[PDB]
Amino acid sequence: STGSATTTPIDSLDDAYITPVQIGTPAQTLNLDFDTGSSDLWVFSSETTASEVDGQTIYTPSKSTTAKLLSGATWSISYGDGSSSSGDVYTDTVSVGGLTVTGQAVESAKKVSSSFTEDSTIDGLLGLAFSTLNTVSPTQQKTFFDNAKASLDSPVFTADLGYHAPGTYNFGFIDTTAYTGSITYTAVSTKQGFWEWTSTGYAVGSGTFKSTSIDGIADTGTTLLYLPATVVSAYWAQVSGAKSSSSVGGYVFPCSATLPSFTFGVGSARIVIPGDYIDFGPISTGSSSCFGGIQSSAGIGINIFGDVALKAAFVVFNGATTPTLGFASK
């Protein structure tokens, strides 16, 4: 089997991407944030505290003839941005782009933190990291990809995120028309539960490539590119007037600037992030200070190849017995 679904930016900045997902019988379609940095499929629901729902579409398990309470199971998750959610668990039928999994754990939110409430466009998350990170207790549950894998034509999914435009998540096949050149594959460590890999270096604009190992994660659920402070300083030093602002929470730059590109290495291959992809717009409405899309990872504990980086590539998440990642230009 295969599946193919379009993923759409939630706003004009590509702050996140939503993909429609069918849950239950008859189908209830929710727009979920596909997140290769986490491993829970959770949704706003009829059980979510009413004051914490503000415009999201909810899953109502009592209206699904295939929903079953997973007795005794609870979940609770906290994300790197400080947001969180928790609740109980159903199993139900879940389909993405024509690919159907029966018995998928659908984690129903009883509580969500303010940033979820305040974002009316995201109805939940669909985790695509390794199932060892799934938070369901006392019986850990498998991700949608893990459940689908054996049925797929090939044990892979691909992320093809657009810049200010829709893109595609495919399951079970590699669309050879969706990228240019060849796909360069690189080793993955699953020891932290992430799609963790080592970039071979970077360049800023037309500058020379610096060969240096940068361990980080391919994370579709993180907006920006978070890299070591040395790398980030080298980037922003090429932008007149750019500075790190403790009050804003990162590097800002004059909105009048033209940003240089940023290149990252995948083995001997190179992925070029155009400068425009690094512009996240005014820090507040009407400001002439703009927020940068490359930020320091120094306070995180891990480097994160988020959407800013991934949207410059066609990315293969290869879930073979020994997982690997593939990157192609497009």
Swiss-Prot record:
Protein origin, superkingdom: Eukaryota
Domain named Peptidase A1: residues: 17-328
Q: Does the keyword Signal apply?
A: yes
**Which residues are named in the active-site annotation?**
D35, S199
What cystine pairs are annotated? C255-C290
Keywords on this record? Aspartyl protease, Disulfide bond, Hydrolase, Protease, Signal, Zymogen
Biological process (GO) annotations held by this record are: proteolysis
Q: Name one GO molecular function term.
A: aspartic-type endopeptidase activity
What top-level class of enzyme does the UniProt entry assign? Answer: hydrolase
Q: What is its EC number?
A: 3.4.23.22
| Family classification | Belongs to the peptidase A1 family.
Q: Name it.
A: Endothiapepsin
